[PDB]
Design a protein around this ligand. Sequence first.
Ligand SMILES: */C=C/C1=C(C)C(=O)N/C1=C\C1=NC(=C\c2[nH]c(/C=C3\NC(=O)C(C=C)=C3C)c(C)c2CCC(=O)O)/C(CCC(=O)O)=C1C
Length: 483
Amino acid sequence: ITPVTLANCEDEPIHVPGAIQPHGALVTLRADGMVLAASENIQALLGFVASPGSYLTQEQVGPEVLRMLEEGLTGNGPWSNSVETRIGEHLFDVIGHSYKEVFYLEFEIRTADTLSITSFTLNAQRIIAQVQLHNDTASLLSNVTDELRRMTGYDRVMAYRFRHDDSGEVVAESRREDLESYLGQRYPASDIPAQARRLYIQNPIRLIADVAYTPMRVFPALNPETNESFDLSYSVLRSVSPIHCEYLTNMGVRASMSISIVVGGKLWGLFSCHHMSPKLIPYPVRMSFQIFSQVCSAIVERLEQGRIAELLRVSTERRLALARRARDADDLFGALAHPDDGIAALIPCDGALVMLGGRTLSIRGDFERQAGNVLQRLQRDPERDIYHTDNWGDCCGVLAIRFHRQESGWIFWFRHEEVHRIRWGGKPEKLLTIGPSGPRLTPRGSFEAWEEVVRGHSTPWSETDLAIAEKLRLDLMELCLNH
Ligand SMILES: */C=C/C1=C(C)C(=O)N/C1=C\C1=NC(=C\c2[nH]c(/C=C3\NC(=O)C(C=C)=C3C)c(C)c2CCC(=O)O)/C(CCC(=O)O)=C1C
């Protein structure tokens, strides 16, 4: 019965809302096919009253439907299927699935004049051609963002990237003129709490037909079998958190639809479609996006590792240049401090320090004091050959490696505090009408929430950045020992 406030919202059970969106009806069955619960609108949408204890009957739901249901009813492992069928006055999409051991049948009115197979195929071809045309991982995102809008007619579609700390960044955008831009927006991990994030990962597509909707409750609330709520995780019609709904209306959005990009076990980022009036996307089309989601995820994965590959390649090429020079010139300092192949170019940094013997070369600033303090901190830890941190002198980020012990051969890279890369301003943008929860649920409030998180922090060191440092360290050890 608990109200969901700003304090609660992190722990909101959004998977068991026990209600569904109004653009469809829902019937929940148990293993034997016996009805356990239904949305309060089954009668109003489909001509009949589903009742707990009942079993579904032909042409109160039609034949092919039970035909489908029986198949999944007798199959081990998460059944999933859909049928198209006429029930009374209308034809329906009857998407059905089984999660836990409860079976779900979802009913959407089908208004499309097209054959489903071809509608599905047509859109799949169109939206994944965008995945064959681009080598830049950012062109991919940018282009499919522009294309998703062309296909769906959404007012605004955005591509989010998710950082290491699960903070988001709007990296692409295609929007109707009128609308303010959110390009370069940054929001915290708390804007998409655990359960919501778990769900985007498990579900390629989420659709919100109308944010201003009144939910259609499924009765009864609790599954008699367990005396605990129905887990609508894989339910297409599952209802929305009032918090998110308030957020979206603060923005002035009325319909959403998001396509996930999952790589590893991580939500790599999603495409969020927003409409200013309510909007619906037919089932077969959503399936076009679902399959797309899986392929795009695959290509983004490769494109990303193709990116790291090239980073490693030019790094070694520079380690080669470095090895070449060092042996022939015989001062390392000159080699390391080289303007372009220098260490400052090896790994993205705002500065670097080279330190062998008693001599100190600070390149791109005065870093001698910091390096001294960092080194003192490592006093307590004589065995550390590598040190790094984004919390901390005057530079937040530090990556230090040791290549000579006795003569204190050290290398440092430094990073300043992370800064909002792109920022809007210039003319006060319009007044958002703000709900009861407060300004926290506006983009402006989200950004501020993000600042408070990152400030005091430099950008984390790449998986890649550390790998390079490690290779460099090996190089110099070799050199110093060798000659
Ligand atoms: C304390 C919990 C929450 C806060 C605070 C909050 O702002 N939202 C909270 C819960 C959920 N958010 C969900 C989706 C969601 N929220 C955001 C934040 C933004 N979305 C935007 O579009 C913009 C700016 C344009 C911001 C700053 C995002 C990006 C998302 C993902 C979907 C989307 O992008 O539209 C969410 C999931 C709700 C659901 O679909 O069930 C919850 C529970």
